[PDB]
Design an enzyme around this catalytic site. Structure first.
Site, mmCIF file in Angstrom:
data_model
loop_
_atom_site.group_PDB
_atom_site.id
_atom_site.type_symbol
_atom_site.label_atom_id
_atom_site.label_comp_id
_atom_site.label_asym_id
_atom_site.label_seq_id
_atom_site.Cartn_x
_atom_site.Cartn_y
_atom_site.Cartn_z
ATOM 1 N N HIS A 120 141.332 29.748 28.938
ATOM 2 C CA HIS A 120 141.090 28.694 29.953
ATOM 3 C C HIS A 120 140.254 27.584 29.339
ATOM 4 C CE1 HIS A 120 140.373 27.069 34.021
ATOM 5 N NE2 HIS A 120 139.046 27.190 33.869
ATOM 6 N N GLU B 190 134.512 22.398 34.673
ATOM 7 C CA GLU B 190 135.518 23.551 34.514
ATOM 8 C C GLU B 190 136.415 23.439 35.750
ATOM 9 O OE1 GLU B 190 135.274 26.845 36.571
ATOM 10 O OE2 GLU B 190 137.337 26.592 35.775
ATOM 11 N N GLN C 192 142.120 22.420 40.478
ATOM 12 C CA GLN C 192 143.365 23.047 39.955
ATOM 13 C C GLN C 192 143.825 24.167 40.897
ATOM 14 O OE1 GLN C 192 144.549 25.837 35.987
ATOM 15 N NE2 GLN C 192 142.647 24.601 35.998
ATOM 16 N N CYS D 99 144.893 23.325 33.334
ATOM 17 C CA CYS D 99 143.439 23.202 33.057
ATOM 18 C C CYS D 99 143.134 22.211 31.940
ATOM 19 C CB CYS D 99 142.797 24.557 32.791
ATOM 20 S SG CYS D 99 143.633 25.530 31.429
#
EC number: 3.4.22.39
Lengths: 11, 203
Positions: free
Chosen positions: B53, B70, B114, B121
């Site tokens: 990720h 993030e 997301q 990502c």
């Protein structure tokens, strides 16, 4: 956009 | 998903080259940049394992702010639970190298942009780094790039009611990349298929 958190960090 | 080579070409197309340190695994050391804006795309896993990720970290040397974007906006405890990722060491290293007072402000996103099944990502990280390179005092929101997408509470990530917002974010992300990146334009269909909104949906 995105909301955010702020944190003061000292080392 | 997105490979490092794809993300480096797209961040260069978006004008971030002067500040971009590159792509890293979870061992990204932190910032050694007391007088320059800098940013990096960082994976939650180690290079040995293979990527898992992507996240973006950015550094403003004048406000001594380290930004963490993030894309799901997980809490620190959820980042450790879900991805075994912690970033205390890179914050400590950044403050000691880059601020005479050994202090920084960490400003981190607390919302998801997301979809739970999306594989975009890395592309969202590129979009946030265009926002940072042009508005390094307000990259998370209230700027022309980030105003195109809308975060939702991370505790509602899987709820039906936020899916249309998360799908709209993915559409705006691809359209933003079509207008700003020749590399995305020339690999449009391929990247949209590899990163699609339900690329990872359970069967």
């Amino acid at each position: 956009g995105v909301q955010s958190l702020k944190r003061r960090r000292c080392f | 998903g997105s490979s490092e080579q794809e993300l480096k070409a797209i961040v260069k197309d978006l004008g971030c080259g002067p500040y971009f340190l590159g792509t890293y695994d979870k061992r990204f050391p932190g910032f050694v940049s007391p007088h320059k804006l800098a940013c990096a795309i960082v994976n939650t896993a180690g290079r040995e394992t293979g990527g898992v990720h992507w996240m973006a970290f950015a550094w403003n040397p004048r406000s001594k702010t380290c930004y963490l974007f993030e894309p799901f906006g997980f809490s620190d405890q959820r980042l450790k639970q879900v991805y075994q990722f912690e970033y205390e060491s890179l914050l400590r290293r950044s403050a000691i190298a880059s601020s005479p007072d050994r202090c920084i402000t960490l400003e981190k996103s607390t919302q998801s942009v997301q979809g739970p099944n999306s594989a975009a990502c890395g592309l969202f990280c590129c979009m946030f780094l265009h926002a940072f390179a042009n508005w390094p005092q307000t990259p998370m929101d209230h700027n022309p790039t980030m105003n195109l997408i809308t975060g939702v509470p991370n505790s509602m990530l899987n709820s039906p009611q936020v899916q249309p917002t998360l799908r709209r974010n993915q559409e705006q992300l691809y359209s933003f990349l079509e207008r700003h990146s020749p590399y995305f334009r020339s690999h449009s269909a391929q990247i949209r298929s590899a990163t699609s909104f339900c690329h990872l949906k359970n069967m």
